[PDB]
Design a protein around this ligand. Structure first.
Ligand code: NAG
Ligand code: NAG
Ligand code: NAG
Ligand code: CL
Ligand code: ZN
Lengths: 595, 97
């Protein structure tokens, strides 16, 4: 009885019971999201943890064999990449103390609590009450105060959470002789053991720190234009030679500055056209929104959904007489079951959100050959990598004009396209200054690098050296930032959104492999692309058996990622910015402040 | 078989063999449930861990996709022996002119 035969004669039973536990948990995970009843609250969480009630003692009984002489790397990629190390190693009281602080770091933070400290007659919360004053205002009694209003109300309450959660990770990291507890987040990223087609252990700095050096010259092209776009209703506080405040977000945490497009509308009270709501006069339903979503997959060649898809999915809103939630989530319940959950209505703004998420379940039917041990993304970002590629492929002119929404009486004019290209200018970069100041905080600080005297005094000057967005009110240690974020409160690693924007264009450049078009690159559609018919069929079925390192070699063969395929698609946008830096602020001042 | 062998509560009646160390020969029925195991022991006790008994079960629920929704398969194997032929196809007739 060799260990190689032992591995398969345990893992076959393991995946056979794992798909059964996955479906028994997915039934409780889906029937709650459509039927909110008080019995369903009791009946979803006991059965969603029934998959965990088997796994919390079965994974220890799965790696009870050490797998010392395993010669097939498939079952070793099955077992060793999913080593559930936890409370069975160190303690059960400290782990339940971490579970206790997880109750106050995520549930109390959820939906927020903002009370007005000036007058008790105004009972207004974050979304009910501050947004209608945020939308239209002219004076500065509340607007510059609105950023630090969260620091004065909630930012002082999250003070015991800042220290113990970052000094627990050194005790958490020393379990299985690994250098970091971020290696548990990097568990799918540690891929050493194959010949050449992985990333080396000494190549980690070369993998991470070097890829940001290419997009930084593209940030200064818009840092001299969008900064000067505040000359509408910003008096006597921000000079055009200085920088931006921190209350231009749209929400309280504000992880992107993409929402500045609504600030720079030239004619707000007089719209030029509206090509989005051209569905309303012909009055299509929510069915034809979904019939064309797989016809977009028929035109590229991807197969249609099963016959059990158009009856179990969410196509009509249940309302309030049948209590339900409207969280847009794709679903792969396993064993050939494919359905989705989305807030479908009569409107047209859900069309782009539907076409962004329709590629998720098409990806879910791509890895249907291997069992549940490999039925995920090769990294955290490949679940939405194919969803973000076709997220911008739905608003194309060859898809929108061909169905009959544009007016045939209007002649082709080249001067009216000044406002059509202004919408996508702030989408691609507007969250990237948020990426690199979060990339430095929690990577190599837990091995004895941050003592008790530089908890947050290392945190504050990272916001103005490279990012630039300056604080309007000075702070101290009582003004804790990262307990206010939405992704930090459930310890989400921000590595998938760093590789999200990069890994799209390597396959977005393969749609037009002959001469990049029959002309300019204002149009791009996959309507009858037989060269892209069987092109992406061998791209997507591999899953995890070949890892995230060489998942980009199926059609091109590139070793790493560069932003050189981002040059040809943004040609009306890059020549709109290269001839602009003539009168804005040159360089950067490290001590400029608006107070 | 869609509305024939599908239970919402669970169709655990149809059992099958997931593990068998011996390979097969045609027309062999295997109904003896000798307890398979991966440990060098004669399965101490009656069952439990490290005694993965070969009988498993199915979990047919009436909303699966194709490939997992259950099918009913029957094979009609024909043989020609030295005995006289007793089963044969139909022989249609005509009118009497
Ligand atoms: C390794 O395992 C995979 C999947 O279990 C299988 O397809 C492959 O043939 C195995 N390789 C060897 C050499 O046994
Ligand atoms: C998917 O669409 C094709 C038409 O391209 C159609 O023939 C097929 O029946 C559809 N699939 C289902 C399950 O209805
Ligand atoms: C689809 O494209 C191929 C090659 O580009 C072409 O040969 C074929 O005629 C096209 N079909 C239609 C209906 O346009
Ligand atoms: Cl920081
Ligand atoms: Zn999504």
């Amino acid at each position: 009885s060799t260990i190689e035969e032992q591995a398969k004669t345990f893992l076959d039973k393991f995946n056979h019971e794992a798909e059964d536990l996955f479906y028994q948990s997915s039934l409780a995970s889906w029937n709650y999201n459509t039927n909110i009843t008080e019995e369903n609250v009791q009946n979803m969480n006991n059965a969603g943890d029934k998959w965990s009630a088997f796994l919390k003692e079965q994974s220890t009984l799965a790696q009870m064999y050490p797998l010392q002489e395993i010669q097939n790397l498939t079952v070793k990629l099955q077992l060793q990449a999913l080593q559930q190390n936890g409370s069975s190693v160190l303690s059960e009281d400290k782990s339940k103390r971490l579970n206790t602080i997880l109750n106050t770091m995520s549930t109390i933070y959820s939906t927020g609590k903002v009370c007005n400290p000036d007058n008790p007659q105004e009972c207004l919360l974050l979304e009910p009450g501050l947004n209608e004053i945020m939308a239209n205002s002219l004076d500065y009694n509340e607007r510059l105060w609105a950023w630090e209003s969260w620091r004065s109300e909630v930012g002082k309450q999250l003070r015991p959470l800042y220290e113990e959660y970052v000094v627990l990770k050194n005790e958490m990291a020393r379990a299985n002789h690994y250098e970091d507890y971020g290696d548990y987040w990097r568990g799918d990223y540690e891929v050493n053991g194959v010949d050449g087609y992985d990333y080396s252990r000494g190549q980690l700095i070369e993998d991470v720190e070097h890829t940001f050096e290419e997009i930084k010259p593209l940030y200064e092209h818009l840092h001299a234009y969008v900064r000067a776009k505040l000359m509408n209703a910003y008096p006597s506080y921000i000079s055009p030679i200085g920088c931006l405040p921190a209350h231009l977000l749209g929400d309280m945490w504000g992880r992107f500055w993409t929402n500045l497009y609504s600030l720079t509308v030239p004619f707000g009270q007089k719209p030029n056209i509206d090509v989005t709501d051209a569905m309303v006069d012909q009055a299509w339903d929510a069915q034809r929104i979904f019939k064309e979503a797989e016809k977009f997959f028929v035109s590229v060649g991807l197969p249609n959904m099963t016959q059990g898809f158009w009856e179990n999915s969410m196509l009509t809103d249940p309302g309030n007489v049948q209590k339900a939630v409207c969280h847009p989530t794709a679903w792969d319940l396993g064993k050939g079951d494919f359905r989705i959950l989305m807030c479908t209505k009569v409107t047209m703004d859900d069309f782009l959100t539907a076409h962004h998420e329709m590629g998720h379940i098409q990806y879910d039917m791509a890895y249907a050959a291997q069992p549940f041990l490999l039925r995920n993304g090769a990294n955290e970002g490949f679940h939405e990598a194919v969803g973000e590629i076709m997220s911008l492929s739905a608003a194309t002119p060859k898809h929108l004009k061909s169905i009959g929404l544009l007016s045939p009486d209007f002649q082709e004019d080249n001067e009216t396209e000044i406002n059509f290209l202004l919408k996508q200018a702030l989408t691609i970069v507007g969250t990237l200054p948020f990426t690199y100041m979060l990339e430095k905080w929690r990577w190599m600080v837990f091995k004895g690098e941050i003592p008790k005297d530089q908890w947050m005094k290392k945190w504050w000057e990272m916001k103005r050296e490279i990012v630039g967005v300056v604080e309007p009110v000075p702070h101290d240690e009582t003004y804790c930032d990262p307990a206010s974020l939405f992704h930090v409160s459930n310890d989400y690693s921000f590595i998938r959104y760093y590789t999200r924007t990069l890994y799209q264009f390597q396959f977005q450049e393969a749609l037009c492999q002959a001469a990049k078009h029959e002309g300019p690159l204002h149009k791009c559609d996959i309507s009858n692309s037989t060269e892209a018919g069987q092109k992406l069929f061998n791209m997507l079925r591999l899953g995890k058996s070949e890892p995230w390192t060489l998942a980009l070699e199926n059609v091109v063969g590139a070793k790493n990622m560069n932003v050189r395929p981002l040059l040809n698609y943004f040609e009306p946008l890059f020549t709109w910015l290269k001839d602009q830096n003539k009168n804005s602020f040159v360089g950067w001042s490290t001590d400029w402040s608006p107070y | 078989s869609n509305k024939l062998d599908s239970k919402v509560s669970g169709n655990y009646n149809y059992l099958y063999r997931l593990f068998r160390k011996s390979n097969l020969k045609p027309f062999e029925r295997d109904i003896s449930t000798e307890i398979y195991q991966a440990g060098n022991k004669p399965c101490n006790g009656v069952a439990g861990f490290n005694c993965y008994f070969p009988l498993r079960s199915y979990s047919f629920r009436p909303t699966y996709g194709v490939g997992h929704q259950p099918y009913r398969v029957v094979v009609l194997s024909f043989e020609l022996l030295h005995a006289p032929a007793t089963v044969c196809g139909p022989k249609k007739s005509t009118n009497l002119v």
